[PDB]
């Protein structure tokens, strides 16, 4: 219990926690310098793409057609922005998780992707890039529908990420 010195304890922590937060910033700011503005050092986590859907739980650009991969160039700053392509029983839009320089490959239950988009350039390199109907005659029941994507580049992980390249959801239109 300092009945003076607190003072000697105050000037202390202010220029030593100080010193310690100015070393810690020191190392963050070194680490941040060794990373690309345009691409991440390890893509591995993202390795196989997952599938996700909109089901909440364009001009500029270039007219395209269903075709082969459209390489844009290197992932670099000195061409401006890399030009992207264009495009009562609910509607579910599926989309393939972006991942930078990945080229997807392709060249009875109850009643109930075009290559030209890839590679995806990554947000710096392409701001307004856009990535790429159960009319059913059964109402009044809860259906389960699993939608999934196929390819050589796409893997599933039944045990883990059930999202990994697939969905699982439970519509229901009661009318």
């Amino acid at each position: 219990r300092t009945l003076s010195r607190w003072v000697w304890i105050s000037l202390y922590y202010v220029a030593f926690y100080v010193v310690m937060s100015g070393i810690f910033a020191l190392c963050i700011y070194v680490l941040m310098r060794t990373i690309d503005p345009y691409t991440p050092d390890y893509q591995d986590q993202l390795k196989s793409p997952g599938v996700t859907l909109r089901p909440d739980v364009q001009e500029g650009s270039i007219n395209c057609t269903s075709e082969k991969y459209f390489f844009q160039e290197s992932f670099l700053a000195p061409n401006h922005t890399k030009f992207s392509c264009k495009f009562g029983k609910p509607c579910f839009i599926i989309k393939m998780n972006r991942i930078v320089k990945f080229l997807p490959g392709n060249s009875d239950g109850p009643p109930l992707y075009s290559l030209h988009y890839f590679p995806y350039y990554g947000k710096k390199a392409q701001p307004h890039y856009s990535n790429p109907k159960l009319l059913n005659v059964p109402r009044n029941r809860d259906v389960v529908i699993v939608c999934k994507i196929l390819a050589e580049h796409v893997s599933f992980d039944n045990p883990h990420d059930p999202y990994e390249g697939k969905v699982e959801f439970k519509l229901k239109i009661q009318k």
Partner: protein
């Protein structure tokens, strides 16, 4: 309850016999009537001891699960359980989290409990070896016919009869005897038989001939005396009731730990509730805010800790077991390092318990033999004519004999049938002279007149070996003044010469001096019987004197004494240096007690009591000032009379004290007096006399071999070895550890911070949880454990024996400056080292730190498969979770890396790593390697991603915390330096443990 017993007893011994009879309502001759005996039992109730009340219920086990600490883990386990229950409001994950944790907790209570209990389950047992000393029947006279009855029946009033070889059944007034001698070691701690007689010898009842006491055994003779006192009334059974049912109480180490849980519960709770109120500002209701309070338990409570302290204690204890120092209790390992005062029993503790010769006066010169066991002194004189002729009488005029049992053991050490005095002489002559049997052989013993009490001298006539003489030699010994009256000449050197008046004093002179020593003195003379009066054949007539008794040749004087084990005087002086006070406490008489005190160094050379001063100074006793007399010696007879506030003052007043001729209660009183003082006392004792004391001491040490069963049961420790030295080792074994324990606390606690901060940042920042509850258990349970325990090997930064005893209240084991250091400074460096690794793994993945803030609700949201990273890529639930799980693993590693620095730093408080050597501790270096290898396992080895959610790391990931570990090493290294050398001021008085 316990007080009355403390006072001495009050007696009837010079009441007359009839009078006693009329008190008790009993008949001297005929004794109690059977009728009256029975009625007197129901009134008094048996002559037996009350079943050692305090019957520790085997259920004790459960004393271990509780304590205070185990209580912080039980509270904590139960808090985890309540939170799981509170969860139960939904759909929750705690199926791996909260219920696992609260289980890990109680399981750590239980386990640590069982370890402690086990180890402890080895020592108890006192009242068991105390009533391994009880007669059985007895022979009372009732109606006027006698009859051995069950002891328990005896009452006050009845006539009892004891002969050689019995136990006094109860306290008794001696009405009739003779030659009856008794053994009263139980009271005095002194075995030499005492004479009983029907007249009161003295005022003190402990002193009179006429009372015989229970817990004593009648040595020889025969006698009858009226039961004054039965059961727990007897002098002794009071001493009995006054022990066993004694209450053990907390140790210091145990106290320092409960203080520690006090500072720990003081932060855990104050952050835990503060995490409530902050939470609540933010936008969490009673629901969530409460959750975090209790959530904040685990980070705070080192699970870690109880098991480290025990292993550390356990480990130290098996270094001491190797020292031939056994330790019954784990807590005992420290204690030692607090003992202020030691109350030591003399006989059989400080001393070997034995007897021997001292010196001889012959040739007009005083002679100093060697009294030591393994005979370390010098041979005093072998040359003289006088000496042999002395040696001759000592061996011949002597009825003693060594036991077969023996040729193996040395001569001092072997048992001898005979009286103490004559065994002394036999051993003396055995050791300097050669075999005695040889001599006795040689000079066959024709006729001898045994040592009468009358004559007060024993003589023998031997046929002289010299074949050329085989004439007759007369040898005698006995009271020095009785020998002299007995002589006309003196053998001074070789020849005789006329016991002038000058040598009548010189003698006179040696006699008085050797007396003073407190030594027993004998006189020796012999005579070459004139051949022409006693023919080769001649009868002598041990009957009546047909041979000469007077005008003999005075040979010389012999005395004796008693010394103490070997290590003791040294063992004593270390202690004092230790700055402990040593206090002798003996049943034994005052001359002896003081001479030993002087030998061992309890009393230091020309220290002085007031009666020594009065001598030199030629002056009375008053005009001495008591103050001057540092030392004291207080005879029990005087102790009785004083109030306990006169005891306390003696106790302040003198630095070297000797209480002699103390009774067991008195030994008890002293120890209590010392404790009123608030000092930690160790009683060291061997006998049944020392029982209460020992029972009373903070720590009661008993000599293993010599020690009565009774002291051993009474005692906490036992010196198997009898080795008094071990007591110093015992006192040291309770310092180093103390300091090294703080290092391991600092070490463990530090890690707590890198463990807490992620959770808080989680709730505050809204970022994905950086570190998980399972991750935490690997650090506390696993990785931290070797290195924590690792500290116990650390050595002394300074010569520890040099500093004073710690003031218990002032200098706690865990103080603010440790917390500050651990939490405020070091820790905090560790946290950042942790968080760094978190940003690096996420950043690498695509999630830059800026984008991390406020994410948790989307990131935890199980339904968005869609989560967009900084780059724009969408991640499923599971995929972004693997990433966060990888962070959890990295953070876990960060800490270990940082813990390497914390380990090195924590190896020394003041000293740099350079002077110390962080190097010579091999156990610590093993902890660094057996903690990394653990981390790497949790990370690498398959199965680990599903079971403990630990994911594999890239090589890069290891090195994230490395700037952080280095900075810690350095930061502390600089701090100490700067401590070392402003020792008075500021760094030292905030950070110095």
């Amino acid at each position: 309850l316990e007080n009355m017993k403390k006072e001495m007893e009050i007696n009837d011994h010079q009441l007359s016999v009839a009078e006693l009879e009329q008190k008790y309502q009993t008949s001297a001759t005929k004794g109690l009537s059977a009728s009256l005996a029975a009625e007197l039992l129901l009134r008094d109730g048996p002559n037996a001891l009350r079943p050692p009340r305090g019957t520790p219920e085997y259920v004790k086990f459960a004393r271990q699960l509780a304590g205070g600490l185990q209580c912080l883990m039980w509270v904590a386990a139960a808090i985890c359980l309540i939170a799981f229950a509170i969860q139960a409001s939904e759909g929750d994950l705690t199926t791996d989290d909260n219920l696992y944790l609260a289980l890990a907790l109680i399981a750590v209570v239980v386990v640590t409990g069982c370890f402690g209990y086990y180890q402890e389950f080895k020592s108890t047992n006192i009242i068991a070896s105390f009533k391994n000393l009880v007669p059985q029947q007895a022979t009372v006279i009732r109606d006027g016919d006698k009859f051995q009855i069950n002891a328990d029946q005896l009452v006050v009033g009845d006539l009892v009869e004891m002969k050689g070889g019995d136990r006094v059944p109860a306290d008794i007034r001696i009405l009739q005897a003779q030659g009856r001698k008794v053994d009263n070691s139980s009271l005095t701690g002194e075995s030499e038989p005492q004479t009983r007689s029907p007249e009161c010898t003295h005022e003190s009842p402990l002193e009179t001939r006429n009372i015989a006491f229970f817990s004593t055994m009648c040595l020889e003779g025969t006698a009858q005396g009226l039961v004054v006192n039965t059961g727990d009334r007897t002098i002794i059974g009071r001493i009995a009731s006054l022990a066993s049912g004694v209450e053990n109480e907390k140790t210091p180490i145990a106290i320092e730990i409960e203080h520690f849980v006090d500072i720990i519960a003081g932060l855990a709770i104050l952050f835990g509730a503060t995490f409530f109120i902050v939470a609540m500002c933010i936008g969490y209701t009673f629901l969530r805010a409460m959750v975090f309070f209790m959530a904040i338990v685990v980070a705070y409570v080192p699970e870690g800790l109880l098991a480290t302290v025990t292993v550390c204690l356990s480990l130290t204890a098996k270094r001491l077991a190797s020292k031939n120092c056994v330790v019954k209790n784990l807590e005992a390992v420290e204690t030692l390092g607090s003992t202020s005062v030691i109350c030591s029993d003399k006989t059989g503790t400080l001393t070997q318990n034995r007897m021997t010769v001292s010196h001889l006066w012959f040739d007009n010169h005083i002679h100093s033999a060697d009294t030591t066991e393994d005979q370390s002194g010098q041979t005093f004189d072998q040359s003289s004519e006088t000496w042999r002729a002395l040696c001759r009488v000592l061996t011949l005029c002597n009825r003693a004999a060594f036991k077969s049992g023996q040729d193996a053991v040395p001569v001092p050490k072997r048992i001898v049938i005979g009286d103490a005095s004559e065994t002394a002489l036999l051993k003396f002559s055995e050791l300097t002279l050669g075999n005695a049997m040889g001599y006795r052989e040689r000079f066959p013993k024709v006729c001898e007149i045994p040592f009468n009490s009358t004559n007060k001298f024993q003589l023998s006539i031997h046929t002289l070996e010299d074949p050329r003489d085989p004439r007759h030699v007369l040898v005698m010994k006995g009271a020095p003044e009785r020998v002299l009256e007995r002589c006309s000449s003196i053998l001074i050197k070789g020849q005789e010469l006329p016991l002038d008046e000058q040598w009548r004093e010189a003698f006179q002179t040696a006699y008085l001096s050797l007396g003073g020593l407190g030594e027993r003195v004998l006189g020796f003379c012999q005579l070459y019987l004139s051949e022409k009066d006693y023919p080769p054949g001649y009868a002598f007539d041990v009957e009546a004197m047909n041979f000469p008794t007077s005008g003999l040749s005075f040979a010389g004087l012999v005395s004796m004494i008693d010394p103490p084990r070997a290590t003791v005087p040294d063992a004593v002086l270390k202690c004092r240096t230790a700055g402990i006070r040593v206090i002798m406490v003996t049943g034994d008489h005052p001359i002896t007690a003081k001479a030993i005190a002087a030998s061992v160094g309890i009393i230091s050379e020309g220290s002085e009591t007031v009666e020594d001063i009065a001598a030199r100074l030629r002056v009375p006793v008053d005009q001495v000032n008591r103050k001057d007399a540092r030392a004291c010696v207080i005879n029990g007879m005087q102790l009785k009379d004083m109030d306990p506030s006169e005891l306390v003052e003696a106790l302040r007043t003198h630095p070297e004290m000797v209480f002699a001729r103390t009774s067991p209660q008195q030994k008890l009183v002293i120890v209590e007096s010392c404790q009123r003082l608030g000092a930690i006392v160790a009683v060291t004792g061997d006998g049944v006399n020392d029982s209460p004391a020992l029972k009373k001491a903070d720590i009661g040490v008993a000599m293993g071999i010599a020690g009565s069963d009774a002291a051993k049961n009474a005692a906490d420790m036992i010196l198997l070895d009898d080795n008094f030295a071990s007591i110093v080792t015992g006192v040291e074994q309770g310092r180093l550890i103390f300091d090294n324990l703080k290092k391991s606390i600092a070490y463990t606690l530090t890690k707590n911070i890198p463990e807490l901060t992620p959770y808080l940042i989680y709730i505050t920042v809204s970022v994905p949880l950086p570190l998980g509850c399972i991750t935490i258990l690997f650090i506390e349970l696993c990785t931290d454990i070797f290195p924590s325990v690792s500290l116990a090997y650390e050595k002394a930064e300074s010569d520890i024996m040099h500093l004073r005893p710690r003031n218990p209240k002032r200098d706690r084991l865990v103080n603010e400056p440790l917390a500050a250091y651990s939490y405020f400074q070091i820790g905090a460096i560790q946290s950042f080292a942790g968080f760094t690794d978190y940003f690096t793994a996420m950043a690498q993945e695509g999630w830059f730190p800026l984008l991390c803030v406020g994410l948790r609700p989307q990131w935890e949201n199980h339904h968005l498969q869609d989560l967009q990273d900084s780059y724009g890529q969408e991640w499923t639930f599971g995929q972004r979770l693997y990433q966060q799980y990888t962070c959890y693993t990295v953070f876990f590693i960060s800490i270990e890396m940082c813990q390497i620095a914390d380990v090195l730093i924590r190896k020394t408080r003041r000293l740099s790593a350079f002077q110390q050597g962080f190097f010579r501790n091999r156990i610590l270096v093993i902890a660094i390697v057996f903690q990394v290898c653990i981390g790497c396992f949790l990370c690498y080895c398959p199965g680990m991603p599903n079971i403990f959610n630990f994911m594999p790391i890239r090589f890069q990931w290891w090195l994230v915390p490395m700037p952080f570990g280095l900075l810690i090493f350095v930061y502390d290294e600089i701090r100490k330096l700067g401590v070392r050398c402003c020792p008075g001021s500021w760094w030292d008085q905030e950070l110095y443990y």
